[PDB]
Structure 1
Amino acid sequence: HAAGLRSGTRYAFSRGFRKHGQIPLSTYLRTYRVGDIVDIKVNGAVQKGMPHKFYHGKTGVVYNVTKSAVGVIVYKRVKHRYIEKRINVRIEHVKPSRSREDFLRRVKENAELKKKAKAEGVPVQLKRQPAMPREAHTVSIADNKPVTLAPVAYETTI
């Protein structure tokens, strides 16, 4: 048996059905800054700057920006500890991450909520709550007569 660099990447590194050929150029048109959070997804058509198969499907933080690639910090679990790994990835294997979009939209929503609450004199709720049990309510059967169901007898269908 073998332990080469791209062992077991038959499907992960492959391009999807009817997804071959030309690479969209918005990938190259994107810009990245140090501290940005990016998702790593290996493009099989770009053999330069390929990250190892472990980092495929991982999310990290950009720590270095270069001509055609970014340095990403990932944390890899080995034995009983976490190791900080730094990988140089070409842009084609890097996608900006929505892993923080909810928080980044909540921070500004909370800012406007705070200023509006201060203006209006009544505090509002800034922190999200988990789904709560449903409240009491009344269901009218007017024009919604219940339909009585019974278990069906067994019969063969072949």
Structure 2
Amino acid sequence: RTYRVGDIVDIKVNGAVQKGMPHKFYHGKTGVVYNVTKSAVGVIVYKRVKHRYIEKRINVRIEHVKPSRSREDFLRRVKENAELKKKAKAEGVPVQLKRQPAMPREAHTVSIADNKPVTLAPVAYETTI
């Protein structure tokens, strides 16, 4: 797999080399590629200092770089938003196009006919013996 200038990549230093490696801040970070070399790549990372952002450039080898899926969900949601909007226009019915956060659970009833509860002590009596 080759990398090109402009895409978004993750930096994960693989292997057991993380013993005396100097700079562990950029492990697990995500950035934009600005320079490509055969076995190295240039990554633009941002760091927060108090109230501002400071840009940094790092040179990371290829085996510690994987492509990112940051925009995958956005491009997907755009695709099915267009598709279900066209389907809703074809069928003449409304449909939800916005994500909603998780709602509280509603009222329901749980039967104990075949699911009689088990009484638990703070420690197990099998462990006491």
Assess same fold via TM > 0.5.
yes
| Unmatched segments (≥5 aa) in structure 2 | none
Cα distance 1:142–1:54, how it changes in 2: closer, same or farther (>3 A)? closer
| CA deviation map 1:48-78 (0-9, x unaligned) | 9999422111111222333332221100123
Partner of 1:60: 31
Judged with a 3 Å threshold, the aligned counterparts in structure 2 of structure 1 residues 45 and 134 are, in CA distance, closer, same or farther, namely closer
Q: Which has the higher strand share?
A: 2
Matching residue of 1:86: 57
* CA drift at 1:101: 2.7
Give the TM-score normalised by the residue count of structure 2. Answer: 0.71
Separation of aligned partners in 2, 1:147 and 1:33: 60
**Runs of 4+ displaced beyond 3 Å:** 43-52, 136-156
In the alignment, is the contact (CA less than 8 A) between 1:37 and 1:59 conserved in 2?
yes
SS in 2 for 1:53: coil
C-alpha displacement at 1:91, in angstroms? 0.9
Deviations 1:124-155 (A, max 9, x none): 11111111122333445555566777889999
For the aligned residues, what is the CA RMSD? 4.2
How far off its partner does 1:121 sit?
A: 1.2
Change (3 A) 1:40 1:151: closer
Partner of 2:119: 148
Partner of 1:133: 104
Q: Secondary structure of the equivalent of 2:123?
A: coil
Structure 1: unaligned runs, 5 residues or longer: 1-29
Q: Distance in 1 between matches of 2:27 and 2:45?
A: 11
Partner secondary structure for residue 55 of structure 1: coil
Q: How far, CA to CA, are the matches of 2:6 and 2:97 in structure 1?
A: 26
Displacement of 1:85? 0.8
TM-score by length of 1: 0.60
Moved more, 145-154 or 132-141: 145-154
Cα separation, 1, equivalents of 2:18 and 2:123: 60
Deviation, structure 1 residue 115? 1.5
Taking a change above 3 Å as real, the CA distance of residues 53 and 150 of structure 1, as seen in their structure-2 partners, is: closer
Q: Are the structure 2 counterparts of residues 96 and 48 from structure 1 closer, same or farther at C-alpha, using a change threshold of 3 Å?
A: farther
